[PDB]
Amino acid sequence: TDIDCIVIGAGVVGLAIARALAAGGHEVLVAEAAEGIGTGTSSRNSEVIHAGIYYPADSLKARLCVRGKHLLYEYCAARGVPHQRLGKLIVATSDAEASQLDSIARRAGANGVDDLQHIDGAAARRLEPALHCTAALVSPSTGIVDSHALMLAYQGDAESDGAQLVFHTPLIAGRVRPEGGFELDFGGAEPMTLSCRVLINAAGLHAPGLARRIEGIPRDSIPPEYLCKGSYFTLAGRAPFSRLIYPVPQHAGLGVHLTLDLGGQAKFGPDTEWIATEDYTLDPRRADVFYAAVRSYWPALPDGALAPGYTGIRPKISGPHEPAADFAIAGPASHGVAGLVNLYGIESPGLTASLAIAEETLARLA
Amino acid sequence: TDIDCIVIGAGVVGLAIARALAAGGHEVLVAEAAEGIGTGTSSRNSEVIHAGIYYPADSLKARLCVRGKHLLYEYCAARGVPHQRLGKLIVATSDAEASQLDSIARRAGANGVDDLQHIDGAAARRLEPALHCTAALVSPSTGIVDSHALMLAYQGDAESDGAQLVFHTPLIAGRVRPEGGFELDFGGAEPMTLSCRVLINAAGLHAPGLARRIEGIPRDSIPPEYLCKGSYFTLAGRAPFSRLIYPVPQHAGLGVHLTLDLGGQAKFGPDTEWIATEDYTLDPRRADVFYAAVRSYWPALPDGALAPGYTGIRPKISGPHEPAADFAIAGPASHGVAGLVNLYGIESPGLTASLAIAEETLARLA
Numbered sequence: 001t002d003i004d005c006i007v008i009g010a011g012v013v014g015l016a017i018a019r020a021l022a023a024g025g026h027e028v029l030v031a032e033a034a035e036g037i038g039t040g041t042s043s044r045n046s047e048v049i050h051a052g053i054y055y056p057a058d059s060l061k062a063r064l065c066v067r068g069k070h071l072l073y074e075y076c077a078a079r080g081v082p083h084q085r086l087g088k089l090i091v092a093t094s095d096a097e098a099s100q101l102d103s104i105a106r107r108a109g110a111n112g113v114d115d116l117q118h119i120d121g122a123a124a125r126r127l128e129p130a131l132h133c134t135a136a137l138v139s140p141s142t143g144i145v146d147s148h149a150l151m152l153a154y155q156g157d158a159e160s161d162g163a164q165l166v167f168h169t170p171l172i173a174g175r176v177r178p179e180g181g182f183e184l185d186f187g188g189a190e191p192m193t194l195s196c197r198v199l200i201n202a203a204g205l206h207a208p209g210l211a212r213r214i215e216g217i218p219r220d221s222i223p224p225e226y227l228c229k230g231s232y233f234t235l236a237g238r239a240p241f242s243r244l245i246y247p248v249p250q251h252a253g254l255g256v257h258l259t260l261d262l263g264g265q266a267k268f269g270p271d272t273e274w275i276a277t278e279d280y281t282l283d284p285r286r287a288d289v290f291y292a293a294v295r296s297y298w299p300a301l302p303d304g305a306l307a308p309g310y311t312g313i314r315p316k317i318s319g320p321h322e323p324a325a326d327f328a329i330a331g332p333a334s335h336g337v338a339g340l341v342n343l344y345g346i347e348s349p350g351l352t353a354s355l356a357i358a359e360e361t362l363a364r365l366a
Numbered sequence: 367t368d369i370d371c372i373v374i375g376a377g378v379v380g381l382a383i384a385r386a387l388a389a390g391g392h393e394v395l396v397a398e399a400a401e402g403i404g405t406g407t408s409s410r411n412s413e414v415i416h417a418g419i420y421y422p423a424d425s426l427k428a429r430l431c432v433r434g435k436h437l438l439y440e441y442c443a444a445r446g447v448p449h450q451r452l453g454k455l456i457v458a459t460s461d462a463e464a465s466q467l468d469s470i471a472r473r474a475g476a477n478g479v480d481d482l483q484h485i486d487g488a489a490a491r492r493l494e495p496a497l498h499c500t501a502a503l504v505s506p507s508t509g510i511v512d513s514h515a516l517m518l519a520y521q522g523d524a525e526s527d528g529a530q531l532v533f534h535t536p537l538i539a540g541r542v543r544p545e546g547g548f549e550l551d552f553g554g555a556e557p558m559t560l561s562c563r564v565l566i567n568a569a570g571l572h573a574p575g576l577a578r579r580i581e582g583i584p585r586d587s588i589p590p591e592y593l594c595k596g597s598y599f600t601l602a603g604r605a606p607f608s609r610l611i612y613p614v615p616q617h618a619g620l621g622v623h624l625t626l627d628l629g630g631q632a633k634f635g636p637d638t639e640w641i642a643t644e645d646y647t648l649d650p651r652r653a654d655v656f657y658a659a660v661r662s663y664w665p666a667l668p669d670g671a672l673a674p675g676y677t678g679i680r681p682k683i684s685g686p687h688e689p690a691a692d693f694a695i696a697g698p699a700s701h702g703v704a705g706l707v708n709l710y711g712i713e714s715p716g717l718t719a720s721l722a723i724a725e726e727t728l729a730r731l732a
């Protein structure tokens with residue numbers, strides 16, 4: 001018999017969607033190619049709860065980041081998911097950069113982020129004794145979250161509403177059925193075929209390629225699949241700052257974020273590296289260029305202190321010389337396929353936006 | 367513009383093409399994402415020089431395997447590339463399988479493979495004392511090759527004719543210029559954009575995805591990109607057979623090949639496992655089902671003797687329930703794009719066919 005809804009991918013976004021579908025009374029099967037939940041791009045990010053500052057007005061990134069932030073802070077408090085509203089400084093390290101702050105704060109305001117504080121460098125140093133900057137914007141609503149815990153929590157909720165998750169179960173090929181619904185061929189060690197009424201393609205890095213593997217999805221609707229890797233490095237011995245530090249959006253060349261984990265340890269990154277294949281191997285040498293970038297706002301960074309961290313890969317749907325694409329949530333109104341939502345290019349701030357992306361997917365599926 | 371011919375991929379097929387274009391007088395640049403040559407599917411295969419036996423009549427696999435074999439044996443002998451014409455038995459392990467051998471031999475003959483010997487089980491045992499079968503076909507032209515040495519030889523040839531190879535240089539995005547030629551965005555330590563007159567996409571597992579990242583290549587022309595992994599297990603010590611041993615194609619369930627390397631060690635596999643992502647991790651549990659399959663023809667396979675080997679992934683352009691697609695060699699006559707050849711689905715016997723694939727690529731380019 002048909003399963004009602006199949007969600008492909010058990011990342012944070014796939015799980016938020018499964019959770020929403022199951023809460024709506026639908027039978028849900030989540031198929032994940034990996035051996036567990038949240039091993040993918042949901043385990044290789046900064047884990048920052050973003051405020052919604054610099055996304056373009058009315059973009060999905062802007063709307064879903066701000067809505068998602070509110071839903072997520074409430075969810076974390078309600079469910080006891082570890083998180084901290086520790087705040088962030090966007091720091092200007094030259095007079096030219098300091099001049100950029102006013103417009104950045106106005107963009108945030110227009111997105112519904114109305115708590116930014118514009119302060120001078122001396123004020124910023126009062127807040128953060130180790131910090132060297134010309135001026136800053138304080139973003140008090142920016143936080144951090146344990147994304148693994150968040151994933152498990154979404155999973156728990158969905159299961160409580162009858163969802164079933166099946167691991168090491170890769171979707172290989174599918175077809176839109178003439179009569180409606182989908183027929184799906186799964187691979188791995190135990191290949192099998194299942195059919196369903198609703199299909200959610202939340203496959204992340206692989207969503208566009210996977211859509212191309214489903215007969216009946218228009219090929220002109222599917223974006224190209226690019227990969228933009230990011231590497232993080234860690235700092236042993238407890239952090240020099242109590243808030244996240246971000247250079248200005250338009251900072252020239254490499255902008256190194258200083259972020260914090262829940263245990264209080266600082267990490268640096270991610271950088272940007274366009275690559276041809278899905279390769280998570282950490283190149284420790286990529287830290288070399290971090291030093292001068294970080295020392296612009298934290299000159300006390302010691303030599304050799306940037307220890308190997310980890311990598312992630314962003315799902316890109318536009319190329320290295322194009323302006324960044326918005327999130328793509330493609331439902332029947334754009335591709336013409338009843339019962340299908342493809343999600344493409346859910347890079348940052350996808351974790352922050354996750355519960356809002358779930359809302360929007362259901363809205364579009366309708 | 368910058369560059370006459372650019373070849374994407376330094377696997378055995380990309381190198382054969384680069385060698386042919388350079389020999390034809392073209393300035394050639396080969397761009398490879400990895401650090402050296404042949405680190406892709408060209409490093410994870412059986413290394414068998416196939417005879418041309420079972421491929422569909424008039425297919426590219428049939429024609430290029432047979433032509434390729436003759437060119438390859440000549441090349442190896444002329445240049446000193448290590449190889450062995452060891453021969454192969456196709457073995458029937460039941461009365462029903464034995465009844466299939468005549469039609470297999472007829473197919474081979476139609477493909478231009480005229481040297482198969484149809485013999486009984488006793489005769490087969492005289493050749494291979496450890497074999498248990500009802501009947502067999504001997505394929506004396508089947509062999510094995512040192513594929514790394516082969517690729518180094520191809521590279522040397524191309525370089526002798528002016529070719530340049532650049533590594534850690536992934537092609538990220540590109541576009542077809544309306545006036546002809548291509549503009550290509552490369553990553554790596556120093557990202558750069560280059561233009562060229564001729565573009566050969568020999569990107570293997572990623573060829574279809576890469577084609578989709580080149581604006582101007584008709585999207586309907588580009589097949590889906592599937593991945594079909596295969597696992598191998600090795601046998602420590604003395605090999606039981608002096609020829610390769612293949613069960614008949616229509617063998618029920620898993621057919622396990624027994625092949626030999628140039629050092630005389632036996633290995634078993636590969637199996638078939640359709641997967642979602644490029645993961646080469648060997649799962650030792652996959653050997654469990656090999657035992658019964660191998661024992662159909664080598665019942666003396668000892669308990670526990672299947673040691674972890676390695677895996678490879680086949681580039682597929684048709685799905686698990688479709689007939690195996692032919693090699694894809696997609697020039698201007700098919701997609702309309704001047705100076706472009708895309709190679710897709712170059713799985714086995716692509717190593718054997720490599721020099722013939724290069725011939726066909728140049729023919730189709732022109």
Ligand SMILES: Cc1cc2nc3c(=O)[nH]c(=O)nc-3n(C[C@H](O)[C@H](O)[C@H](O)COP(=O)(O)OP(=O)(O)OC[C@H]3O[C@@H](n4cnc5c(N)ncnc54)[C@H](O)[C@@H]3O)c2cc1C
Binds near residue numbers: 015
């Ligand atoms: C370096 C980096 C830093 C980031 N930092 C932040 C941040 O600080 N704050 C923030 O809000 N966001 C951040 N993000 C974004 C956030 O990490 C992602 O938006 C989020 O994890 C995406 O989750 P997802 O479910 O869409 O994708 P994924 O976690 O990638 O899940 C997709 C799943 O699909 C599975 N899959 C793929 N193909 C198949 C198939 N054929 N069959 C079955 N399963 C399949 C995969 O195994 C995977 O588990 C960052 C992203 C990156 C890359």
Ligand SMILES: Cc1cc2nc3c(=O)[nH]c(=O)nc-3n(C[C@H](O)[C@H](O)[C@H](O)COP(=O)(O)OP(=O)(O)OC[C@H]3O[C@@H](n4cnc5c(N)ncnc54)[C@H](O)[C@@H]3O)c2cc1C
Binds near residue numbers: 572636
């Ligand atoms: C398990 C297995 C066993 C096999 N056994 C046999 C056999 O016994 N006999 C036989 O004849 N054939 C066999 N084959 C087939 C043979 O291995 C292949 O046909 C051959 O290796 C393919 O070579 P290639 O150059 O097309 O691909 P590859 O070797 O995969 O080369 C593609 C190259 O492109 C590069 N690349 C990808 N994307 C980019 C990018 N965007 N930019 C720059 N570079 C990029 C990759 O890094 C890679 O090096 C086997 C195949 C498999 C999977």
